[PDB]
Amino acid sequence: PGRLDRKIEFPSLRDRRERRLIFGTIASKMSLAPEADLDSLIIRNDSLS
Amino acid sequence: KMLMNLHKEQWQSGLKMYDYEEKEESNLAATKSMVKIAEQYSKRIEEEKELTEEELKTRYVGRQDPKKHLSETADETLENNIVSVLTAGVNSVAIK
Amino acid sequence: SMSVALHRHSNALVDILPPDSDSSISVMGENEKPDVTYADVGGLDMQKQEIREAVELPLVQADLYEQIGIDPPRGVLLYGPPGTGKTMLVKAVANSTK
Amino acid sequence: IRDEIAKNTELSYDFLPLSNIKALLFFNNEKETEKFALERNWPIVNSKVYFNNQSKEKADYEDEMMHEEDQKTNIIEKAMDYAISIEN
Amino acid sequence: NFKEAAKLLVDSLATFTSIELTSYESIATYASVTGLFTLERTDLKSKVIDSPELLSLISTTAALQSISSLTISLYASDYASYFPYLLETYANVLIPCKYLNRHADFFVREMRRKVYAQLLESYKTLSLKSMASAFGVSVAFLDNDLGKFIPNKQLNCVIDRVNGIVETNRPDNKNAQYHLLVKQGDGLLTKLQKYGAAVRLT
Amino acid sequence: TFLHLPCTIEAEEAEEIGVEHLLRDVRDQAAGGLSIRLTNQLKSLKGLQSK
Amino acid sequence: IETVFVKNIRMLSFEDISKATHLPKDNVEHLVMRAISLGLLKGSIDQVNELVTISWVQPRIISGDQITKMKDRLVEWNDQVEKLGKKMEARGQSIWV
Amino acid sequence: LDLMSGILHCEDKDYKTAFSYFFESFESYHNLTTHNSYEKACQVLKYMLLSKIMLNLIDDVKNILNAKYTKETYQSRGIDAMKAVAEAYNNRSLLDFNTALKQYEKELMGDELTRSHFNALYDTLLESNLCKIIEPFECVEISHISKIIGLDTQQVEGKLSQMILDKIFYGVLDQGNGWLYVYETPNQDATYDSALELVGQLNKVVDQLFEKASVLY
Amino acid sequence: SQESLVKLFTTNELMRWPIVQKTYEPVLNEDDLAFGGEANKHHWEDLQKRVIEHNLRVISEYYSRITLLRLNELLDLTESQTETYISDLVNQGIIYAKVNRPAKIVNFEKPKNSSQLLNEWSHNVDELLEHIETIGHLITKEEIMH
Ligand SMILES: Nc1ncnc2c1ncn2[C@@H]1O[C@H](COP(=O)(O)OP(=O)(O)OP(=O)(O)O)[C@@H](O)[C@H]1O
Numbered sequence A: 001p002g003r004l005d006r007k008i009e010f011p012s013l014r015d016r017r018e019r020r021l022i023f024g025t026i027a028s029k030m031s032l033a034p035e036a037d038l039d040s041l042i043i044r045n046d047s048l049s
Numbered sequence B: 001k002m003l004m005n006l007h008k009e010q011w012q013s014g015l016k017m018y019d020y021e022e023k024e025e026s027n028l029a030a031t032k033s034m035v036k037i038a039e040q041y042s043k044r045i046e047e048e049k050e051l052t053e054e055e056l057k058t059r060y061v062g063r064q065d066p067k068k069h070l071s072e073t074a075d076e077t078l079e080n081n082i083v084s085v086l087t088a089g090v091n092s093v094a095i096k
Numbered sequence C: 001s002m003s004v005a006l007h008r009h010s011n012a013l014v015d016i017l018p019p020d021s022d023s024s025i026s027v028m029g030e031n032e033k034p035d036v037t038y039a040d041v042g043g044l045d046m047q048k049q050e051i052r053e054a055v056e057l058p059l060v061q062a063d064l065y066e067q068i069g070i071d072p073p074r075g076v077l078l079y080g081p082p083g084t085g086k087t088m089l090v091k092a093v094a095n096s097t098k
Numbered sequence D: 001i002r003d004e005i006a007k008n009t010e011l012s013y014d015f016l017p018l019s020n021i022k023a024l025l026f027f028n029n030e031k032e033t034e035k036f037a038l039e040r041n042w043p044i045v046n047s048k049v050y051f052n053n054q055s056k057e058k059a060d061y062e063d064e065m066m067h068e069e070d071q072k073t074n075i076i077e078k079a080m081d082y083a084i085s086i087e088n
Numbered sequence E: 001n002f003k004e005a006a007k008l009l010v011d012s013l014a015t016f017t018s019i020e021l022t023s024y025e026s027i028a029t030y031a032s033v034t035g036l037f038t039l040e041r042t043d044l045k046s047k048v049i050d051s052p053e054l055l056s057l058i059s060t061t062a063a064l065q066s067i068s069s070l071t072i073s074l075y076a077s078d079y080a081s082y083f084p085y086l087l088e089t090y091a092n093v094l095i096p097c098k099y100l101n102r103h104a105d106f107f108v109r110e111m112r113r114k115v116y117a118q119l120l121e122s123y124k125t126l127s128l129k130s131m132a133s134a135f136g137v138s139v140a141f142l143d144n145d146l147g148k149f150i151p152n153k154q155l156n157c158v159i160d161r162v163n164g165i166v167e168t169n170r171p172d173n174k175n176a177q178y179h180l181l182v183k184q185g186d187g188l189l190t191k192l193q194k195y196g197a198a199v200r201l202t
Numbered sequence F: 001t002f003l004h005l006p007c008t009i010e011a012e013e014a015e016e017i018g019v020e021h022l023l024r025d026v027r028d029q030a031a032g033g034l035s036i037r038l039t040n041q042l043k044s045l046k047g048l049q050s051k
Numbered sequence G: 001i002e003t004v005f006v007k008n009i010r011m012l013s014f015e016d017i018s019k020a021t022h023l024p025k026d027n028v029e030h031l032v033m034r035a036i037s038l039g040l041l042k043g044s045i046d047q048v049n050e051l052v053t054i055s056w057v058q059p060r061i062i063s064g065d066q067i068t069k070m071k072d073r074l075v076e077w078n079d080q081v082e083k084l085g086k087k088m089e090a091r092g093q094s095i096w097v
Numbered sequence H: 001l002d003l004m005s006g007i008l009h010c011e012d013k014d015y016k017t018a019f020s021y022f023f024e025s026f027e028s029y030h031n032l033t034t035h036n037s038y039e040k041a042c043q044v045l046k047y048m049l050l051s052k053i054m055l056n057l058i059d060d061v062k063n064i065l066n067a068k069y070t071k072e073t074y075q076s077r078g079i080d081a082m083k084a085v086a087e088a089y090n091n092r093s094l095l096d097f098n099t100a101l102k103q104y105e106k107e108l109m110g111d112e113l114t115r116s117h118f119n120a121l122y123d124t125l126l127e128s129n130l131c132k133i134i135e136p137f138e139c140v141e142i143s144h145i146s147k148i149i150g151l152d153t154q155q156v157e158g159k160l161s162q163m164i165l166d167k168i169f170y171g172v173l174d175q176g177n178g179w180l181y182v183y184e185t186p187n188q189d190a191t192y193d194s195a196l197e198l199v200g201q202l203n204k205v206v207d208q209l210f211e212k213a214s215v216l217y
Numbered sequence I: 001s002q003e004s005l006v007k008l009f010t011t012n013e014l015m016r017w018p019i020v021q022k023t024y025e026p027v028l029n030e031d032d033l034a035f036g037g038e039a040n041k042h043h044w045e046d047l048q049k050r051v052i053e054h055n056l057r058v059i060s061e062y063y064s065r066i067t068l069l070r071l072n073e074l075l076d077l078t079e080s081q082t083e084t085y086i087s088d089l090v091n092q093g094i095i096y097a098k099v100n101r102p103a104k105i106v107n108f109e110k111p112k113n114s115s116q117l118l119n120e121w122s123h124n125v126d127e128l129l130e131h132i133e134t135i136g137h138l139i140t141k142e143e144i145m146h
């Protein structure tokens, strides 16, 4: 502390809800299966960074 | 005599009038500048009644004087706009 | 003591330089982050907030901090597994700071 | 009285019929309505007096002034005027 | 001066001390009144209506209920209900208060002036018919309300009695602006003349 | 035939040094202060008028 | 092209063209639009104010009569400059430098 | 816990972060035993769809709706209210919306949240629709405006006033001659504003000098 | 036939729709795989939209203002269909106009800016002074050679 009182540790464990948010940002750049259920992929991913 | 002349575009340029986009920009900058240097001058007269002139010059920034700086700024702009109004009016009456 | 200009052939002090001069170049690219924004993020929405709070927020609002009474935000250490952009985290924020 | 009403109403009307100009400035007789017109230099056209013509007549006199160049002041004179005060 | 009254009294909502102090009930009302005057529509929204503290206090004092009504109806552009609200605000809030007894008359004038301003800006022309009906008064009444504020030069508007319209002629052009500017320089030219001369003698 | 093609005096940089040395006159036209350009503006009207 | 050239005014009414060319007022507009299209003249076409206000005269054959016009118009211009010059000498006679 | 963070965000006018919470909340209540938690699940389903209406997405409405269970195990009046309002919005049609909430009023009355965000949605579409009409015209009749939007005249006029004070096209309305003129021109010049600061300062300064120069007196 | 068609559309013209339609009805409309098919009857209908957009572009440039009453006549459209066509072509950002609903005018102009006008004026004065400066040299040249 005082050098560095703020310390942010970044996980990769994440949350289900966290993965939905990464997808959206991507989707703005290039839509991934916009006529099919995206949400399967979210469930299936479970370690992914 | 040869050196002094630099064509006929020496004198033609006195009539020549720039973009008025530029004039407005120069005059804008100068307006703000005088406010910002007026504040600098306000600090100069914050009190400025303590002894010895030399110690005041260093303390209230009388070296690199804000009063002199205001004066120059005003005069360049005042005189420039004087010539611009004059050359414009010259142009109106002369051509048509 | 700071950098200053000297004439080439008169070898004297004729002119002054900012001290900023004659010091490290500041971002060797262009300063800001490429088209990558909070939209592109995709993280880490919360922790990115914590980075905004730390870096941009005091700099934009000084007065706000003065109200709490605290000294302004201390250094940040970004550690974790990679592929977290942690480097991109700083660039994104800094973009928006001005 | 009939005079003062006549100088004022140049700025107040553009025309009156012969009945209405009588009533307003108080003329007593029909002939008096037209006689006072010639003297204040309003024409009668179609039984109507026009104050607008007096307006114009006043305007031509201003232009026959030789006083008016320096008084109104050319744009070119004004800029010169400001310039030279400093140069003193 | 209500400008300094609104800056202190709206801030003091958010962290308010009643240790050897007065009630929050008087201060939330007194704060709303002075905010209504000074703040413009945009900041009215921020600091009065969307104030979380004022929200939470809800309607529990008749005073509070009276001034709350009045700001909302000014904001949402309603005119029918503004005219009876104004009357109630005066009766139940301004008068009982000792300190706003003194500013009671000013509140009524300005409040009408403020609701007119919004309407006059937004329209080039009105009818005397439509304006009157909208506030919820008549043609005979509206003509008197307007004869107070227009000769003082607040609203910058005329009423065509002959046509039946309320015409708008608020200058926003350079001419309006030049007039403001020369009033600042003319107070300068006089003040130089007195300070300059005075030193010249002694 | 001999057609007119635009010309102007502009000076080299190495030339310049001497041009500065030999000009020690006040310069009636040099584009200076308020004074210098009020003299110019008049000069300019008679220039054009003769052309 | 000829009438706006010889006149000093550089905006021409529709009624002027209608009498000269012996055509309806309808037919006149048409003529103007076609002149803009060719590059015979260029400028703005105002139907409401019934103008054509030109910005370009495409260069024409120059006969002795047109030189006479061009020469005349520049005598007035030379006189205009000269009169302004006499005024410019009167104000500021006392100080120049 | 998740749902309540959802409601709060939805209201802060962020609809991505909101959406993920209501998604979780839908899944929680489907996976618990349904005795009272279908009810709570149906309510949440309205809120997931509601997030996306505000973002103006009907693709991701297609993805979330399904005939497997979100229209056959949660087939309800709120579903029919949502895909009417969703469809209306994209068309850019206020008319359609207006008619959709007449027969689905009970959805605004029962749901606080649905109502806050449909109030906003109304205002948003009317504002949008207007800009398009008044761009290529000036001196357009107020009556004309009413034809296209599909509202009473008197309504149109009160609505448009607000949006002059809102200050996104700021013109003036003619009640008596029934025109709208659009003004979009600058309302000050830069040199005049910078002048105001300048003469203001000099006013102060001269007083300050005299304070120092009154030693003569 | 093709040659007159291409030429018409390239160069800037004012033309009226039932007279152009009458020219190319026994010519182009009976040529199959263009206009003579069935769903190319609605590519013929489309030819009209392209003609009335051509007239709108031309008239936009050359006419600074024109009454709406007039503009209707020249385009061969009804009042209602004129306004909607102006509007669509202003969304697509090519042209700019202000159309009155009382139907007094259409002002095909985007209202010109203060700075640009002044800029435009200052340049013209420099062209007059340059023009005279060059002329004087060529007077000297001609007199002496004579
Ligand atoms: N939140 C995000 N949304 C979008 N793209 C992202 C995001 N996070 C990371 N990425 C992508 O992954 C890349 C790798 O991230 P970054 O370069 O910041 O790594 P790091 O964690 O700092 O590693 P090291 O340990 O090497 O410093 C980014 O350049 C970006 O393309």
Ligand SMILES: [Mg+2]
Pocket (backbone or CB within 6 Å): C086, C087
């Ligand atoms: Mg890194």
